[PDB]
Structure 1
Amino acid sequence: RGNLMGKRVDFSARTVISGDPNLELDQVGVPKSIAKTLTYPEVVTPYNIDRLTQLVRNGPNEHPGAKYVIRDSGDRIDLRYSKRAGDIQLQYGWKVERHIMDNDPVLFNRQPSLHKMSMMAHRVKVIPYSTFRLNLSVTSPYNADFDGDEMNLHVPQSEETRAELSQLCAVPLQIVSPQSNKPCMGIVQDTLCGIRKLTLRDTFIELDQVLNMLYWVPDWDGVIPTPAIIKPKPLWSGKQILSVAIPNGIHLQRFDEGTTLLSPKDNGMLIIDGQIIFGVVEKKTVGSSNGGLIHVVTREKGPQVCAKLFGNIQKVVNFWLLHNGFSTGIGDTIADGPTMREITETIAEAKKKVLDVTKEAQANLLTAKHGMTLRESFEDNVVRFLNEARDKAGRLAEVNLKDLNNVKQMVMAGSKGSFINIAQMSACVGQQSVEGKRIAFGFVDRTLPHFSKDDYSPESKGFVENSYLRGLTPQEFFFHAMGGREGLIDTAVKTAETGYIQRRLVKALEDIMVHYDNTTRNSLGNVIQFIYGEDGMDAAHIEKQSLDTIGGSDAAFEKRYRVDLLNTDHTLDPSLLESGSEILGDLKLQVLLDEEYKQLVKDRKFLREVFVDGEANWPLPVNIRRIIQNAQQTFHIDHTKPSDLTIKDIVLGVKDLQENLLVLRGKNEIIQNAQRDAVTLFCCLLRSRLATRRVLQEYRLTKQAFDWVLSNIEAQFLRSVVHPGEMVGVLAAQSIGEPATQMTLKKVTSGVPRLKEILNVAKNMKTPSLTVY
């Protein structure tokens, strides 16, 4: 039982962590002293007889050394105490307990480990000074920072055990996690703040620095890119150099509010063939976002390339930031004198509204809503007036801050800070509260002995008019400390309660595994799900894709999918296809084209039943839009020529592909049907994306490009299928627990208390509600 609690910890060290921008994402800085204590039993073979010999000579005191040499018979020779330490002849088959060295797979863990991503394998990088070092972007999954935190490093002891870490646990193989079918690692702090400044149009760089920046990227091919400016001075763009970091064959389109192909605001994102075309690079693109740069590279180029991308981007930006500089100070929290007069009036305006409701209530003219107290309606209105006031006063402060304002800058890049922050620092702090109400009359009919009895005003019950810049009044101070205290306490509870839930979730789902028949079962062999996640797919291979068929007017649906060769106005113009003019009035093809349409129209029905809401964006395997954009890039498709695709090509081809996307292979009737159900949704997506008109009119694919797209979808589909052996149970529990730990905060029980009320199956709920339409 002692070994069931980690009492006998052998071959592992622990220390303080530190961030290091000059280490690769999968590496871990292991201080020489610690690497001299941990060992790995390596066998003597002609592949290492030499190196092993050198180590043993270096002994236990010099780093690349060893501590013991075990002989065939099993005899141990202590290299520190042995009249022959420097006189040994290694024999094939002998063992040498050498110190850990560069690139050895080691398990790294930050407790509490409620996330498989809290234990990832890292390559060893032995360095000087004490303290374990990490790349800034591995910080989020481990949920650590560098103000005292300590993590554990574990050294695998066998050859099989070494492979298991690097082939399953390796940091790169975790970037895109199944918890949320999206990356869990991305660019943070400085690099994030610095990357946005770098990408701004006004950001240009001179030759002297571009060369250094280029050279900082180790995967650079020595080809100095041509300046975006050649005129009176060869000037480059931030975007230009950043692209050296992004590998070829990457595409990323993202349209924001008014983003156009000429995004004036330098909005959205557009990276073609590994070169940014337009848009400032920030959290939306480089963050752990769903369909961002990181998600793409991982899938498009693989985990190793993606891992290298973290380090490349960080070197160019950190370097660029180290010579540009960024700071923050009191100044950044000061709003315009006129803005302050607009803010103070906004607040005074709210205090007038509250004053009118009070008079109204004191006169008894105010009426309470159904099932609500007179006093409840009153409070409800005053708090709304006051929060409304804080909020609007906050916007005034934000609008005023310039694009130079550092606080505003960190918010635009997505690296620390938010609205509520600016609003409280610069303008009004807001209404304090404890247990969802304004500060209560703790003394008789008053909040403090400094007020008069029965004072229901905003200053009386906790409204903090002042900002942090201005400083709180002693009353605002105490009120805010009462609000604050509630947070410290709730956090302790939220921390104590969630930790227990996380362990109950694991314990209950711990033995559930995906078997070779795609079935999900528990240790007894009971079927929990006839196919995992009712689709037999691996969550880390699922991406949010829009199901077009479902939305829009019927006209728009028909204008996009309907093809009528028997109609001069609804056939495929001869310019979209060679056989264009001879397709007209082709009875036989039209029959084929009506089959495709009826099937799409069926889907529209089907989808509108499954998603009654009408929601079109749903996570699925095999990102079709990307495969298509890639095809176009790969085959340099020109929208100025008619394709060479036959109609039978598209229809029959799209039809044939659906027969190969396999989840289940059983030859019996039951399975073949279970196989049709599990691929129904993806198939509805497929048909809407490879509808003949879409292929010829929108994508302009050629017979070659098209053919390529099909085999790709197949290879990716099969690749997105769940692997038998997946401990899907434990995964599920941790996926519900880890984020449930991040629940620190209308009148319905939610948060942890609700979850604990759900998982307990309590007969007496706190807020038994009933919604009746």
Structure 2
Amino acid sequence: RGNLMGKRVDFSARTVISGDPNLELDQVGVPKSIAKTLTYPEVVTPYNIDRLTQLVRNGPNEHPGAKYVIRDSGDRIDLRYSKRAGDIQLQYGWKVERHIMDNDPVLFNRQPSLHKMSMMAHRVKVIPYSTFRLNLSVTSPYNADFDGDEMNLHVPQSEETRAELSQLCAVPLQIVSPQSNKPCMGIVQDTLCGIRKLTLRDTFIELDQVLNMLYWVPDWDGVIPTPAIIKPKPLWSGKQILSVAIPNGIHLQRFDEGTTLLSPKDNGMLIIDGQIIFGVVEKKTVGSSNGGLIHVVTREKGPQVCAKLFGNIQKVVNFWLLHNGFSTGIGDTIADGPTMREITETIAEAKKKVLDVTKEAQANLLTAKHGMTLRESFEDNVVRFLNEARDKAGRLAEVNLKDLNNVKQMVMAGSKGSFINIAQMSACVGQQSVEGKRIAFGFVDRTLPHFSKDDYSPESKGFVENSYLRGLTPQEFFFHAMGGREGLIDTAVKTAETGYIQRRLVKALEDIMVHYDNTTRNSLGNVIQFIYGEDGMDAAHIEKQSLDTIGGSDAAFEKRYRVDLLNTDHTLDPSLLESGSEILGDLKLQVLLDEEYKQLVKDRKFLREVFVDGEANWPLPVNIRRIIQNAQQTFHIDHTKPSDLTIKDIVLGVKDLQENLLVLRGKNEIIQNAQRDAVTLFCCLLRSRLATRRVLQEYRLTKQAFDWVLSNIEAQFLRSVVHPGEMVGVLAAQSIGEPATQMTLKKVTSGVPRLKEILNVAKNMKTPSLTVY
């Protein structure tokens, strides 16, 4: 374990890290003193000898330079103090151990390495200071802070190794992660706060700042966008400038809570061809969310486009924020005098509730519910009362905070903060817990020697009603310290336990690989799975989509999918199809729709069988909402003209498309049936969305766009397949172990201890339970 599975390596660097808004995502800022030490053995060829000769002329004491020359004989020339490092005549076939230089592929790493995303490849960018510099939207997979963190760097030594770094482990390749089938990176901190401050309808920009922001976009087209206001004064909206960073052909739809198509509170998000229509931009739009900007762009334009998108968004928002400013002080912790009066009134009211319950318990007039102790009921009730009091005081505070409250600004943006933060800082920090219960009688029948014996009051057992603004009393201080000490012990223990758990998982699944027969075997030929994930899809190519045959009344299902040419009232309106009236009452063209509806009903029955609770949103490979939205733009569909789609076209084309979807390839019955199984749910999705009434009335496609959608679905499906050689065992182990490392803290074992019980198949669980229906 110390010299074979892991050892010390040459060509390695390690340094304190800091952030840089002006570094591209896949770039790493390398100190010049480090670049002079790490070398690459470039072989002299006619393509490099004019460059390598000058490099070696520079020498090792300055960069770009070189440190050694290796000849055909195998002898080594030390350029530091060889007498002939001025008359070096380079011959082809030699090697120059040249200095590391810009846009070299290097392997950047932070420890612990719970992730393949913990060791990603970066392009070298030699910078003139002693710290490793990296873009902020790469801090998340590394879990890197800039408070003293050190990170390590490794240099490949062969063209094959550089190829592996740049075409497998590169940062843009790792944007969408198979763990959680979502992006692992997003816009954070200053960028995330300013992007919300900037996307408001109150945010307007004048010509000078607009032009500076426009030029700040590196991939700018030079077309100054026409302002949203012209006559009184040329004024741009922050959304207008920000959409310059968004590539053309990007469509994003999302509705949040009270979102009309007029979005009164500027909720949700609507981006129509890289120009946002409505919606304040915050962590839902631009974070590492499922279906956010990053997911859509990475899947639509590609990893490199998204990687530049990170930089463009940062460079516009950071500039706007730099010239707009943002701060925070104790002012943002104060609520109105009326508010604090209500808050302390609420706290006293809950204290009176507890006192009444306590006198009731002392009178032996309590009705302990079945199962639990009298005292257990008393505790439960008091803890519930105090938790409610803290939360109600917190809501009073949060309601009282204006929209200028910088803490509320950060919380609304999602950059930093939560409800409990505001509540404890400005209303009441709440109840303190040790080992999951209130403060115990560490003394004889009392918590502190300043209390009388047998005192179960909120104050005596660890209820802090003061806020961090107000100030904690000595007993409240000690109780808070007791809880916080428990928190530190939990942290320092969970780390070691989860490291051991992660190592056991990785060692147990390290040899699991998808072979070329689409199976999932190990170092013995033993089969683990016959199809990886029972569907054979790379998890990075999978997104939550709704199965539209699951939900709704049977009446709405009929209204959506039923096509009856044998009824004047339930037939395709002739404005939805060129063959409108010519198709009414067609007997032969109704057996097709009847088989379509029959398979749709069978789909609904099957899916309701599989997904009992009727949950329609499930992670499936190919996103068809986006393909339809694209087809409505690449072919500029208008909804007044009728389509040119024969019913035969739609139905038989979707049938053929189902036939054309492949995961396995063999020509025998059992492999054909395994293929037919592995595509069943996706074909259910296909039938739910590619229905004749749907394709005609819900998005009026033409035959051109329809064939385009068919081919695009086929392509993306074939591109979402697992790649043979994928080490899905290590990926699975790390994808389970990393979220376990972030586990930290109702009478059930959970978290790391329960995971340990599951993994060691412990016979004597601490909480065995039977759930009887």
Normalising to structure 2: TM-score of the pair? 1.00
- CA distance in structure 2 between the partners assigned to 1:712 and 1:453 by the alignment: 76
- CA distance in structure 2 between the partners assigned to 1:499 and 1:160 by the alignment: 32
Aligned to 1:523: 523
Structure 1 residues 531, 7: CA separation in 2 closer, same or farther (over 3 Å shift)?
closer
- CA distance in structure 1 between the partners assigned to 2:689 and 2:516 by the alignment: 32
- CA distance in structure 2 between the partners assigned to 1:572 and 1:371 by the alignment: 62
* 1:743-768 deviation per Cα after TM superposition (whole angstroms, max 9, x unaligned): 01121000000000000001100001
* 1:206-233 deviation per Cα after TM superposition (whole angstroms, max 9, x unaligned): 0000000000001000000000000121
- CA distance in structure 2 between the partners assigned to 1:274 and 1:742 by the alignment: 36
- CA distance in structure 1 between the partners assigned to 2:736 and 2:184 by the alignment: 15
- CA distance in structure 1 between the partners assigned to 2:16 and 2:5 by the alignment: 22
* 1:478-512 deviation per Cα after TM superposition (whole angstroms, max 9, x unaligned): 01111111100011111110010000000000000
Residue 528 of structure 1 aligns to a residue in which SS?
strand
- CA distance in structure 1 between the partners assigned to 2:66 and 2:647 by the alignment: 70
Aligned to 2:659: 659
- CA distance in structure 2 between the partners assigned to 1:4 and 1:153 by the alignment: 20
- CA distance in structure 2 between the partners assigned to 1:2 and 1:110 by the alignment: 19
- TM-fit CA distance, 1:74: 1.0
Q: Is the 8 A contact 1:108 1:151 kept in 2?
A: yes
- TM-fit CA distance, 1:8: 3.1
* 1:529-578 deviation per Cα after TM superposition (whole angstroms, max 9, x unaligned): 01100000100000000001000000000000000001101110001001
* 1:423-467 deviation per Cα after TM superposition (whole angstroms, max 9, x unaligned): 000001100011111101111111111111111110111111100
- CA distance in structure 1 between the partners assigned to 2:471 and 2:770 by the alignment: 46
Q: Is the 8 A contact 1:216 1:316 kept in 2?
A: yes
- CA distance in structure 2 between the partners assigned to 1:146 and 1:627 by the alignment: 41
Residue 490 of structure 2 aligns to a residue in which SS?
helix
Residue 232 of structure 1 aligns to a residue in which SS?
coil
Residue 243 of structure 2 aligns to a residue in which SS?
helix
- CA distance in structure 2 between the partners assigned to 1:443 and 1:11 by the alignment: 59
- TM-fit CA distance, 1:22: 0.3
- CA distance in structure 1 between the partners assigned to 2:342 and 2:639 by the alignment: 54
Where does structure 2 lack aligned partners over 5 or more consecutive residues? Answer: none
Aligned to 2:126: 126
Runs of at least 4 residues off by over 6 Å: none
- CA distance in structure 1 between the partners assigned to 2:429 and 2:60 by the alignment: 60
Residue 575 of structure 1 aligns to a residue in which SS?
helix
- CA distance in structure 2 between the partners assigned to 1:258 and 1:409 by the alignment: 20
* 1:602-630 deviation per Cα after TM superposition (whole angstroms, max 9, x unaligned): 00000000000110100000001110011
* 1:68-111 deviation per Cα after TM superposition (whole angstroms, max 9, x unaligned): 11111111111011111011110111100001000000000001
- CA distance in structure 2 between the partners assigned to 1:2 and 1:615 by the alignment: 49
Residue 151 of structure 1 aligns to a residue in which SS?
strand
Greater alpha carbon shift after TM alignment, 446-455 vs 374-383: 446-455
Residue 640 of structure 1 aligns to a residue in which SS?
coil
- CA distance in structure 2 between the partners assigned to 1:41 and 1:246 by the alignment: 40
Aligned to 1:625: 625
* 1:700-721 deviation per Cα after TM superposition (whole angstroms, max 9, x unaligned): 0011111110000000000000
- CA distance in structure 2 between the partners assigned to 1:607 and 1:64 by the alignment: 63
* 1:692-745 deviation per Cα after TM superposition (whole angstroms, max 9, x unaligned): 000000010011111110000000000000000000000000000011001011
Aligned to 1:3: 3
Residue 89 of structure 1 aligns to a residue in which SS?
coil
1:272 aligns with 2:266: no
* 1:252-271 deviation per Cα after TM superposition (whole angstroms, max 9, x unaligned): 00001010110010110000
* 1:340-384 deviation per Cα after TM superposition (whole angstroms, max 9, x unaligned): 111111111101110110010000001111011110000000000
Aligned to 1:641: 641
Residue 659 of structure 1 aligns to a residue in which SS?
helix
Identity within the alignment, %: 100
- TM-fit CA distance, 1:639: 1.1
- CA distance in structure 2 between the partners assigned to 1:630 and 1:113 by the alignment: 39
- CA distance in structure 2 between the partners assigned to 1:208 and 1:84 by the alignment: 58
Residue 29 of structure 2 aligns to a residue in which SS?
strand
- CA distance in structure 2 between the partners assigned to 1:238 and 1:225 by the alignment: 12
- TM-fit CA distance, 1:7: 3.6
- CA distance in structure 1 between the partners assigned to 2:301 and 2:515 by the alignment: 29
- CA distance in structure 2 between the partners assigned to 1:8 and 1:732 by the alignment: 27
Aligned to 1:483: 483
- TM-fit CA distance, 1:3: 4.0
Aligned to 2:704: 704
- CA distance in structure 2 between the partners assigned to 1:224 and 1:288 by the alignment: 30
Q: Is the 8 A contact 1:544 1:617 kept in 2?
A: yes
* 1:89-144 deviation per Cα after TM superposition (whole angstroms, max 9, x unaligned): 10111100001000000000001111000000000000101111000000000111
Q: Is the 8 A contact 1:2 1:8 kept in 2?
A: no
Greater alpha carbon shift after TM alignment, 437-446 vs 202-211: 437-446
- CA distance in structure 1 between the partners assigned to 2:753 and 2:521 by the alignment: 30
Q: Is the 8 A contact 1:185 1:288 kept in 2?
A: yes
- CA distance in structure 2 between the partners assigned to 1:736 and 1:181 by the alignment: 13
- CA distance in structure 1 between the partners assigned to 2:8 and 2:249 by the alignment: 50
Aligned to 1:41: 41
- TM-fit CA distance, 1:5: 5.5
- CA distance in structure 1 between the partners assigned to 2:85 and 2:554 by the alignment: 85
- CA distance in structure 1 between the partners assigned to 2:88 and 2:445 by the alignment: 89
Aligned to 1:29: 29
- TM-fit CA distance, 1:62: 1.0
- TM-fit CA distance, 1:2: 5.2
Structure 1 residues 429, 2: CA separation in 2 closer, same or farther (over 3 Å shift)?
closer
- CA distance in structure 2 between the partners assigned to 1:331 and 1:620 by the alignment: 48
- TM-fit CA distance, 1:6: 4.3
- TM-fit CA distance, 1:4: 2.4
* 1:138-159 deviation per Cα after TM superposition (whole angstroms, max 9, x unaligned): 0000111101100100000000
- CA distance in structure 2 between the partners assigned to 1:530 and 1:722 by the alignment: 13
Write out aligned runs for 1:489-528 (5 A).
Answer: 489-528=489-528
- CA distance in structure 2 between the partners assigned to 1:130 and 1:665 by the alignment: 55
Please give the root-mean-square deviation of Cα atoms over the aligned residues, in Å.
0.7
Q: Is the 8 A contact 1:438 1:462 kept in 2?
A: yes
- CA distance in structure 1 between the partners assigned to 2:367 and 2:603 by the alignment: 52
- TM-fit CA distance, 1:688: 0.4
- CA distance in structure 2 between the partners assigned to 1:237 and 1:257 by the alignment: 24
- CA distance in structure 1 between the partners assigned to 2:96 and 2:567 by the alignment: 82
Q: Is the 8 A contact 1:565 1:572 kept in 2?
A: yes
Aligned to 2:303: 303
- CA distance in structure 2 between the partners assigned to 1:317 and 1:356 by the alignment: 55
Aligned to 1:229: 229
- TM-fit CA distance, 1:647: 0.1
- CA distance in structure 2 between the partners assigned to 1:2 and 1:318 by the alignment: 45
Residue 168 of structure 2 aligns to a residue in which SS?
helix
Greater alpha carbon shift after TM alignment, 1-10 vs 726-735: 1-10
Residue 514 of structure 1 aligns to a residue in which SS?
coil
Q: Is the 8 A contact 1:179 1:539 kept in 2?
A: yes
- CA distance in structure 2 between the partners assigned to 1:686 and 1:387 by the alignment: 48
Aligned to 2:165: 165
- CA distance in structure 2 between the partners assigned to 1:341 and 1:98 by the alignment: 71
- CA distance in structure 2 between the partners assigned to 1:2 and 1:256 by the alignment: 52
* 1:174-203 deviation per Cα after TM superposition (whole angstroms, max 9, x unaligned): 000001110000000000000000000010
Write out aligned runs for 1:105-184 (5 A).
Answer: 105-184=105-184
- CA distance in structure 1 between the partners assigned to 2:109 and 2:80 by the alignment: 31
- CA distance in structure 1 between the partners assigned to 2:536 and 2:276 by the alignment: 36
- CA distance in structure 1 between the partners assigned to 2:635 and 2:348 by the alignment: 65
Where does structure 1 lack aligned partners over 5 or more consecutive residues? Answer: none
* 1:376-423 deviation per Cα after TM superposition (whole angstroms, max 9, x unaligned): 000000000000110011000000000000000000000111000000
Residue 121 of structure 1 aligns to a residue in which SS?
strand
- TM-fit CA distance, 1:590: 0.2
- CA distance in structure 1 between the partners assigned to 2:180 and 2:443 by the alignment: 49
Residue 461 of structure 2 aligns to a residue in which SS?
coil
